[PDB]
Design an enzyme around this catalytic site. Structure first.
Site, PDB file in Angstrom:
ATOM      1  N   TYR A   1       0.859  -1.191   0.000  1.00 16.65           N
ATOM      2  CA  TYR A   1       0.000   0.000   0.000  1.00 16.65           C
ATOM      3  C   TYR A   1       0.894   1.240   0.000  1.00 16.65           C
ATOM      4  O   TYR A   1       2.039   1.217   0.471  1.00 16.65           O
ATOM      5  CB  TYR A   1      -0.933   0.046   1.223  1.00 16.65           C
ATOM      6  CG  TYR A   1      -0.182  -0.003   2.541  1.00 16.65           C
ATOM      7  CD1 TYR A   1       0.471   1.128   3.042  1.00 16.65           C
ATOM      8  CD2 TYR A   1      -0.095  -1.185   3.275  1.00 16.65           C
ATOM      9  CE1 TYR A   1       1.190   1.082   4.221  1.00 16.65           C
ATOM     10  CE2 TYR A   1       0.614  -1.235   4.475  1.00 16.65           C
ATOM     11  CZ  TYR A   1       1.252  -0.100   4.940  1.00 16.65           C
ATOM     12  OH  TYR A   1       1.964  -0.138   6.122  1.00 16.65           O
TER      13      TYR A   1
ATOM     14  N   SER B   1       8.523   1.070  15.467  1.00 14.22           N
ATOM     15  CA  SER B   1       8.422   0.195  14.293  1.00 14.22           C
ATOM     16  C   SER B   1       7.196   0.547  13.397  1.00 14.22           C
ATOM     17  O   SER B   1       6.944  -0.103  12.377  1.00 14.22           O
ATOM     18  CB  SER B   1       8.384  -1.253  14.752  1.00 14.22           C
ATOM     19  OG  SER B   1       7.216  -1.474  15.535  1.00 14.22           O
TER      20      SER B   1
ATOM     21  N   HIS C   1      -4.329   7.023  13.504  1.00 13.17           N
ATOM     22  CA  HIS C   1      -4.575   7.962  12.396  1.00 13.17           C
ATOM     23  C   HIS C   1      -6.002   7.908  11.835  1.00 13.17           C
ATOM     24  O   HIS C   1      -6.804   7.060  12.228  1.00 13.17           O
ATOM     25  CB  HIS C   1      -3.558   7.750  11.254  1.00 13.17           C
ATOM     26  CG  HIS C   1      -3.753   6.461  10.504  1.00 13.17           C
ATOM     27  ND1 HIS C   1      -4.363   6.398   9.272  1.00 13.17           N
ATOM     28  CD2 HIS C   1      -3.440   5.186  10.830  1.00 13.17           C
ATOM     29  CE1 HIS C   1      -4.400   5.144   8.862  1.00 13.17           C
ATOM     30  NE2 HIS C   1      -3.857   4.387   9.796  1.00 13.17           N
TER      31      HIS C   1
ATOM     32  N   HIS D   1      -3.515  -2.642   8.698  1.00 11.97           N
ATOM     33  CA  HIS D   1      -2.225  -3.338   8.717  1.00 11.97           C
ATOM     34  C   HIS D   1      -1.449  -3.229  10.044  1.00 11.97           C
ATOM     35  O   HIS D   1      -0.242  -3.517  10.086  1.00 11.97           O
ATOM     36  CB  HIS D   1      -1.373  -2.882   7.539  1.00 11.97           C
ATOM     37  CG  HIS D   1      -2.089  -2.969   6.236  1.00 11.97           C
ATOM     38  ND1 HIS D   1      -2.913  -1.963   5.774  1.00 11.97           N
ATOM     39  CD2 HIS D   1      -2.139  -3.957   5.312  1.00 11.97           C
ATOM     40  CE1 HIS D   1      -3.424  -2.322   4.607  1.00 11.97           C
ATOM     41  NE2 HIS D   1      -2.970  -3.527   4.304  1.00 11.97           N
TER      42      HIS D   1
ATOM     43  N   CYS E   1      -2.325  -0.499  12.410  1.00 12.85           N
ATOM     44  CA  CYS E   1      -2.621   0.831  12.916  1.00 12.85           C
ATOM     45  C   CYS E   1      -3.925   0.914  13.681  1.00 12.85           C
ATOM     46  O   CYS E   1      -4.815   0.093  13.495  1.00 12.85           O
ATOM     47  CB  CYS E   1      -2.656   1.808  11.761  1.00 12.85           C
ATOM     48  SG  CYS E   1      -1.028   2.098  11.131  1.00 12.85           S
TER      49      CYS E   1
ATOM     50  N   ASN F   1      -7.050   2.667  13.625  1.00 13.47           N
ATOM     51  CA  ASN F   1      -7.866   3.401  12.650  1.00 13.47           C
ATOM     52  C   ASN F   1      -9.046   4.112  13.266  1.00 13.47           C
ATOM     53  O   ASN F   1      -9.916   3.468  13.843  1.00 13.47           O
ATOM     54  CB  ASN F   1      -8.430   2.437  11.600  1.00 13.47           C
ATOM     55  CG  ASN F   1      -7.397   1.993  10.566  1.00 13.47           C
ATOM     56  OD1 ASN F   1      -6.200   2.346  10.631  1.00 13.47           O
ATOM     57  ND2 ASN F   1      -7.867   1.206   9.591  1.00 13.47           N
TER      58      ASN F   1
END
Length: 216
Positions: free
Chosen positions: A156, A169, A174, A190, A192, A194
């Site tokens: 992505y 890392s 967000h 992935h 995060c 969200n």
């Protein structure tokens, strides 16, 4: 032969969140770690305890056990250097994998319980006690920076907004407009945390570097 200090974080007189580690960077890789750790003096009115962690060859951090108290002074001495900084409010973000929520409290008061989508089973969100590391209004999320080629099906490249770094890392809290229908319901990212654009914006505007981010 004792390596000289390059820098201390936070900066003198900064007001940081209650999970902010004391980071001491040296001019050379360190051979005698115990000697460096003995040289590092951290003072706080509540006599907080903690441990050292070596995060690079020339970088050590002192992580306060159970957080600093809110609105406290912290004094740091190491070699020829002295400095002081303060903590602000205790603003705790708790991301819950099972509940699909990001809950944010100020000084014990629950402010918001926001819908969230965390990492999919194959790219899970790491369980742990973290802190807000940076605030970026706009950031490019490039899978190459997490070891994934763009062409691979897990690749992505997309520009994101209201991004708060959680781990070195590369986990972030967000804005994820594309997964709004999953937020509060499923874990589809992935790794995060969200949030909806509005919730992400709110949190971005509330958060201070150092603020604890818990993943449970």
């Amino acid at each position: 032969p004792i390596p000289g200090v390059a820098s201390v974080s936070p900066a003198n007189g900064a007001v940081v969140g209650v999970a902010h580690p004391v980071v001491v960077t040296f001019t050379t890789p360190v051979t005698d770690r115990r000697a460096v750790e003995r040289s590092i003096r951290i003072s706080t009115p509540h006599n907080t305890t903690g441990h050292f962690e070596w995060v690079a060859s020339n970088v050590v951090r002192w992580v306060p056990h159970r957080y600093w108290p809110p609105h406290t002074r912290v004094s740091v001495g190491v070699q020829e250097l002295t400095e002081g900084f303060e903590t602000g409010d205790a603003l705790i973000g708790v991301a819950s994998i099972s509940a699909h929520t990001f809950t944010v409290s100020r000084n014990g008061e629950v402010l918001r319980t926001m819908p969230a989508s965390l990492g999919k089973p194959s790219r899970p969100t790491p369980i742990g006690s973290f802190h807000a590391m940076s605030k970026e209004r706009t950031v490019v999320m490039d899978s190459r920076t997490i070891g994934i080629p763009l062409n691979s099906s897990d690749g992505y490249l997309l520009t994101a907004h209201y991004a708060v770094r959680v781990t070195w890392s590369g986990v972030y809290v967000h804005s994820a407009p594309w997964s709004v229908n999953s937020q509060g319901y499923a874990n589809v990212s992935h790794g995060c945390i969200n949030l909806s654009p509005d919730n992400a914006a709110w949190y971005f505007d509330a958060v201070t570097v150092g603020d604890p981010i818990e993943v449970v």
